[PDB]
């Protein structure tokens, strides 16, 4: 995996994190 | 009264200003070294 | 799959809805540890549930079906889980998938998941014997469920016909009428474990009827185990099928021995 | 491969002496297990408590505490 | 014959450490604190599978 | 020193009216957390833990992000905060660590809690999961830690 | 007390705070002792009760 991506997957989290639900 | 619960610390306690302590009144000029320290909860704690 | 994969399961009681820890009052002072009433006389003790499992609508995908749960919410099946979607068992009728996936387990613990015992229970009631793999369930106490209606004695099979239809596959329904009880048997056992804990303190009233709003008043319904059927009429069924059984099992075998050399 | 204690915050303790006024459910049968087995221990605790007592000086004493 | 003092060594040390096995089972099964002061794993299955 | 306002307790420093009024928001929540919400379940009553120690979490973060990131509170202030305890001065010191930037809470990374050698499966990263569950042919089944209800910790997520 | 001395032993490693530290079933935080005398009786009534 790339930082562009994961920079991507982690804005897929409803909440910010760390209590932002990847469901 | 042994009817009533204890009650609760955040109900009632946590939120009251607690009371003044005894304390000695102190002398300025007898006193000096000790009077900033001396009712400290553990005293010069913090001192190196 | 269109009355169950394609929905998500639905929240069928709100917690706050959902019923006092403590019981009906039969005593003078609750006791803690053991959570009842003490210094009372006696008590029936049994109660209409006041909630049922509405099964084609309250079905649906959970939690615990993409993590591979093998069990089923037992709530779910008295009408009672709070948790709905959220939930980490199962919320739907037993299928011929699923009990594939517990044949592994069917053998020592029930469909929701609690270990049966060595012996049944003195009143033939509760989870189970792993001794006896048992498909038939007592259906009894029907007179306090209909809240003492004379109906039929043969409409009173109709809603025992209905009612167990929805829980899964039957084998056979059969009803007595001198004892006023009914005898209903399942393909799997894993159904009879569900419509056991679905069924019990339940009632027949069919809202149409009169007394729907005294549903509550009355005693609910007994689901226990079943004992052996006792005419010979049965009985030869059922080395004819212990026979069938064996005979499946040889062949399976001698494959196994096949495969040993 | 030793990290020392992880200091809980208070109100983590707060809810939970809380939670257990009324065990009534199902749940608290191994906490009521617990209460019960920890009762041979509550006279160390009784001494650890009376000997960190706040003294005429002090208005309150914020002290260390190891919970269950 | 009487036992050889080789022998008398082969069963006390036999017999001493199952005594010691045991006493240190009723020591730390007793659930008083002060008893540890005076006192496996990678099994195989199915043949080894 | 304390939590309660004595009189051996020192007075605020001088940017701390400015941050009050979004601290108190934190205060007040907690003090609703701990109401003793009477709920039966076990799965809900751990739910009502997991906000406790998020809430502690996100107190935390805003006076991390006041002094470290942004730099808008003094000194002298940032540790009175600390010595009137509205901060943890060990959490916020796992954040300054490269591997512990957004950590969950310090019981998540203790190696004596669990049963094996390890940290809380929420430091595991998403992506990691994903692949091991990827193999086994299921999603993955972890949703909520068990100790505050973490998500995932993991600074790369 | 002077002319009977029970003098303490070296081999009492095992403390009860201190054991009961290592084991993840207790947790650690700073409260008030006023606090901490509340709940203690709240928790002896309930041991009791
Ligand atoms: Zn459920
Ligand atoms: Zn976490
Ligand atoms: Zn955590
Ligand atoms: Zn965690």
């Known amino acids: 995996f790339t930082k562009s991506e994961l920079k991507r997957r982690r804005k897929t989290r409803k909440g910010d994190g760390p209590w932002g639900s990847w469901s | 009264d042994d009817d009533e619960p204890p009650l609760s610390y955040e109900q009632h306690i ?35 | 799959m269109t009355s169950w994969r394609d929905k998500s399961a639905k929240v069928q009681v709100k917690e706050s ?38 099964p084609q609508l309250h079905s649906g995908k959970t939690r615990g079906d993409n993590d591979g749960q093998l069990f089923f919410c037992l709530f779910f099946a008295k009408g009672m889980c709070c948790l709905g979607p959220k939930c980490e068992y199962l919320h739907h009728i037993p299928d011929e998938e699923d009990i594939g996936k517990l044949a ?12 049966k015992f060595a012996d049944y229970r003195e009143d033939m009631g509760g989870i189970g014997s792993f001794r006896k793999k048992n498909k038939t369930l007592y259906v009894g106490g029907i007179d306090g469920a209909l809240n003492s209606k004379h109906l039929k004695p043969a409409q009173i099979e109709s809603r025992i016909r209905f009612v167990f239809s929805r829980l899964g596959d039957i084998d056979r329904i059969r009803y007595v009428e001198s004892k006023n009880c009914g005898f209903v048997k399942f393909k799997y056992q894993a159904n009879a474990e569900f419509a056991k804990e679905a069924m019990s303190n339940q009632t027949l009233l069919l809202p149409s009827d009169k007394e729907w709003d005294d549903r509550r008043e009355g005693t609910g319904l007994l689901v226990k185990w079943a004992n052996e059927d006792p005419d010979p009429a049965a009985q030869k069924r059922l080395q004819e099928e212990l026979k069938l059984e064996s005979l499946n099992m040889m062949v399976h075998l001698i494959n196994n021995n096949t495969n040993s050399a | 491969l030793y990290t020392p204690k992880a200091e809980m915050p208070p109100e983590h303790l707060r809810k939970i002496i809380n939670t257990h006024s009324d065990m009534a459910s199902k749940m608290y049968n191994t906490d009521k297990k617990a209460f019960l087995g920890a009762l041979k221990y509550l006279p160390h605790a009784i001494l650890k408590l009376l000997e960190n007592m706040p003294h005429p000086w002090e208005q309150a004493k914020e002290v260390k505490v190891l919970y269950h | 014959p009487l036992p050889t003092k080789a022998e008398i060594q082969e069963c006390t040390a036999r ?15 007793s659930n008083n604190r002060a008893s540890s002061r005076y006192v496996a794993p990678a099994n195989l299955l199915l043949n080894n599978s | 020193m304390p939590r309660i306002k004595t009189r051996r307790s020192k007075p605020a420093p001088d940017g701390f009216e400015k941050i009050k009024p979004t601290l108190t928001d934190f205060e007040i929540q907690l003090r609703d957390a701990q109401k003793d919400k009477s709920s039966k379940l076990a799965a809900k009553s751990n739910e009502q833990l997991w906000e406790i120690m998020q809430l502690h979490h996100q107190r935390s973060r805003y006076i991390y992000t006041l002094y470290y990131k942004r730099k808008a509170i003094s000194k002298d202030l940032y540790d009175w905060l600390i010595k009137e305890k509205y901060a943890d001065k060990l959490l916020i010191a796992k954040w300054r660590k490269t591997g512990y930037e957004k950590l969950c809470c310090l019981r998540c990374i203790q190696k004596n809690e669990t049963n094996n050698g390890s940290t809380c499966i929420c430091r595991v990263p998403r ?9 086994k042919g299921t999603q993955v089944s972890f949703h909520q830690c068990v100790h505050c209800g973490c998500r995932g910790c993991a600074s790369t997520d | 007390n002077e002319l009977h001395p029970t003098l303490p032993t070296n081999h009492n490693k095992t403390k009860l705070l201190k054991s009961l530290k290592n084991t993840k079933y207790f947790q650690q ?21």
């Open chain 7, 29 to 49: 935080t700073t409260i008030d002792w006023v606090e901490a005398g509340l709940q203690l009786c709240r928790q002896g009534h309930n041991m009791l009760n």
């Open chain 3, 17 to 54: 809805e959902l019923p006092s820890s403590i019981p009906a009052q039969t005593g003078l002072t609750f006791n803690i540890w053991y959570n009842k009433w003490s210094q009372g006389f006696a008590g029936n003790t049994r109660f209409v549930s006041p909630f049922a499992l509405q």
């Open chain 6, 127 to 135: 992506a990691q999961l994903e692949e091991e569950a990827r193999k």
């Open chain 3, 104 to 115: 592994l387990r069917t053998e020592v613990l029930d469909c929701f998941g609690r270990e």
């Open chain 5, 15 to 29: 017999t001493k450490s199952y005594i010691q096995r045991l006493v240190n089972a009723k020591l730390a099964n």
């Open chain 2, 14 to 48: 946590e939120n009251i200003e607690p009371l003044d302590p005894i304390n000695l009144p102190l002398d300025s000029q007898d006193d000096e070294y000790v009077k900033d320290w001396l009712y400290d909860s553990r005293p010069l704690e913090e001192d190196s």
